[PDB]
Design an enzyme around this catalytic site. Structure first.
Site, short mmCIF file in Angstrom:
data_model
loop_
_atom_site.label_atom_id
_atom_site.label_comp_id
_atom_site.label_asym_id
_atom_site.label_seq_id
_atom_site.Cartn_x
_atom_site.Cartn_y
_atom_site.Cartn_z
N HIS A 191 0.85 -1.22 0.00
CA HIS A 191 0.00 0.00 0.00
C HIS A 191 0.87 1.25 0.00
O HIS A 191 0.71 2.10 0.89
CB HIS A 191 -0.98 0.02 1.17
CG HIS A 191 -2.18 -0.82 0.90
ND1 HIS A 191 -2.35 -2.04 1.49
CD2 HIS A 191 -3.24 -0.63 0.08
CE1 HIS A 191 -3.47 -2.57 1.07
NE2 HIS A 191 -4.03 -1.74 0.19
N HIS A 246 1.99 1.52 -5.73
CA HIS A 246 0.56 1.14 -5.79
C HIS A 246 -0.24 2.33 -6.30
O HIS A 246 -1.07 2.12 -7.19
CB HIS A 246 0.02 0.66 -4.42
CG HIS A 246 -1.45 0.39 -4.40
ND1 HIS A 246 -2.05 -0.48 -5.28
CD2 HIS A 246 -2.43 0.89 -3.62
CE1 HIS A 246 -3.35 -0.49 -5.03
NE2 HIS A 246 -3.61 0.35 -4.04
N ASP A 251 -4.80 5.81 -1.25
CA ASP A 251 -4.29 5.02 -0.09
C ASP A 251 -3.32 5.89 0.71
O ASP A 251 -2.49 5.36 1.48
CB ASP A 251 -3.73 3.66 -0.53
CG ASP A 251 -4.77 2.54 -0.66
OD1 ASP A 251 -5.74 2.52 0.12
OD2 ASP A 251 -4.62 1.68 -1.57
C1 LIG Z 1 -3.28 -6.17 1.20
C2 LIG Z 1 -4.22 -5.95 0.47
C3 LIG Z 1 -5.35 -5.69 -0.42
C4 LIG Z 1 -6.46 -4.83 -0.13
C5 LIG Z 1 -7.44 -4.68 -1.11
C6 LIG Z 1 -7.29 -5.37 -2.32
C7 LIG Z 1 -6.22 -6.21 -2.58
N1 LIG Z 1 -5.93 -6.90 -3.76
N2 LIG Z 1 -5.54 -6.28 -4.93
C8 LIG Z 1 -5.31 -7.23 -5.82
C9 LIG Z 1 -5.53 -8.50 -5.26
C10 LIG Z 1 -5.90 -8.26 -3.96
C11 LIG Z 1 -6.28 -9.28 -2.96
N3 LIG Z 1 -7.16 -8.94 -2.02
N4 LIG Z 1 -7.51 -9.85 -1.15
C12 LIG Z 1 -8.44 -9.51 -0.17
C13 LIG Z 1 -9.28 -10.53 0.34
C14 LIG Z 1 -10.23 -10.22 1.30
C15 LIG Z 1 -10.37 -8.88 1.71
C16 LIG Z 1 -9.55 -7.87 1.20
C17 LIG Z 1 -8.58 -8.18 0.25
C18 LIG Z 1 -7.04 -11.13 -1.13
C19 LIG Z 1 -6.14 -11.59 -2.02
C20 LIG Z 1 -5.74 -10.68 -2.99
O1 LIG Z 1 -4.96 -11.06 -3.83
C21 LIG Z 1 -5.26 -6.34 -1.63
MG LIG Z 2 -7.29 1.12 0.32
ZN LIG Z 3 -5.47 0.74 -2.99
#
Ligand SMILES: C#Cc1cccc(-n2nccc2-c2nn(-c3ccccc3)ccc2=O)c1
Ligand SMILES: [Mg+2]
Ligand SMILES: [Zn+2]
Length: 315
Positions: free
Chosen positions: A68, A72, A107
């Site tokens: 983050h 990003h 972010d």
């Molecule tokens: C750190 C972080 C974060 C937060 C927001 C989105 C993403 N993001 N962007 C691309 C892929 C992913 C991703 N997001 N999750 C995720 C699962 C449940 C709740 C929240 C996020 C699980 C696996 C992933 O691969 C990551």
């Molecule tokens: Mg965010």
């Molecule tokens: Zn973001």
């Protein structure tokens, strides 16, 4: 006004594509962003010297967290840029202006922890905002930097347009709260399929912009496979640190966040592609068909995570 930012040939071409990677040279990310605002919005829209001062204060209020972070911010801003160039006539002059800024700021001052952890840790920001905790914090930071001296990039807008553009940015930044994504897509799905979706309804634009913002925020899953593979290590490093902080409060974290359960990552990615990303990009292509390449790239990556489970590829 006669100072057209250019990029080397391969960047200048590759930047127009959805799957562009902004590369490892931090020092070029500002020039890349300006190049994008210039082609997306005009040479006119922003005063070069104010813009540059804004970008660098924004850069300074991102932190050194695995995912983050400043990279990003620019990545997400690039995806929005791709979406806006492939949907040239659908968007107003103000939207094009505010959305690229929204993506850069979305972010601001993130510490690598979810809204959930702020609530269980009892972080003062959770007292101040009970829902979209980090996302009202990110918008608040945007407004701070907008009010430093020499930083008001919007100074040429009337009182009206200034309020319009900050209300695009606010809504746009709140929409990056994934918890809101689910209701927002279920409602756009239902509006498109019953043919009520109408882009002159400001209520309906807001929703559409919220989905673009989810699309852009998630776009690491829409890159070529070795970029998706290497971003996931960054994503899980934040997750595993947050699980450690959970264990520290006396709470079993969900397995996604348990670094003792690394074995379940690929299945966890499947879940998330099926439960979140594929639906996001399906619905977004139905509403803006030229964004298909995001859907195509997302499915390829889903198929690459399937290969990882079958042991036909290791990670
Ligand atoms: C750190 C972080 C974060 C937060 C927001 C989105 C993403 N993001 N962007 C691309 C892929 C992913 C991703 N997001 N999750 C995720 C699962 C449940 C709740 C929240 C996020 C699980 C696996 C992933 O691969 C990551
Ligand atoms: Mg965010
Ligand atoms: Zn973001």
């Amino acid at each position: 006004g006669l100072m057209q930012f250019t990029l080397p040939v391969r960047l200048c071409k590759e930047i127009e594509l959805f799957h562009f990677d902004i590369g490892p040279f931090e020092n070029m990310w500002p020039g890349i962003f300006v190049y994008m605002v210039h082609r997306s919005c005009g040479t006119s829209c922003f005063e070069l010297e104010k813009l540059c001062r804004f970008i660098m204060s924004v850069k300074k209020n991102y932190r050194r967290v695995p995912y983050h972070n400043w990279k990003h911010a620019v990545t997400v801003a690039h995806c929005m840029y791709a979406i806006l160039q492939n949907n040239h006539t659908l968007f107003t002059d103000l939207e094009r202006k505010g959305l690229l800024i929204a993506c850069l700021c979305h972010d601001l001052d993130h510490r690598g922890f979810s809204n959930s952890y702020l609530q269980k840790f009892d972080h003062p920001l959770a007292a101040l905002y009970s829902t979209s905790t980090m996302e009202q914090h990110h918008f608040s930071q945007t407004v701070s930097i907008l009010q430093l001296e020499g930083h008001n990039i919007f100074s040429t807008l009337s009182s009206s347009e200034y309020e319009q553009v900050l209300e695009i940015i606010r809504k746009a930044i709140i929409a990056t709260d994934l918890a809101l994504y689910f209701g927002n897509r279920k409602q756009l799905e239902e509006m498109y399929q019953t043919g009520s979706l109408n882009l002159n309804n400001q209520s309906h634009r807001d929703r559409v912009i919220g989905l673009m913002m989810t699309a852009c925020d998630l776009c690491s899953v829409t890159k070529l496979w070795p970029v998706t593979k290497l971003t996931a290590n960054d994503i899980y490093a934040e997750f595993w640190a947050e699980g450690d902080e959970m264990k520290k409060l006396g709470i079993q974290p969900i397995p996604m966040m348990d670094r003792d359960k690394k074995d379940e990552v690929p299945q966890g990615q499947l879940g998330f592609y099926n439960a979140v990303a594929i639906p996001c990009y399906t619905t977004l292509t139905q509403i803006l068909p030229p964004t298909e390449p995001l859907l195509k790239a997302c499915r390829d990556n889903l198929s690459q995570w399937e290969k990882v489970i079958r042991g036909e590829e290791t990670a």
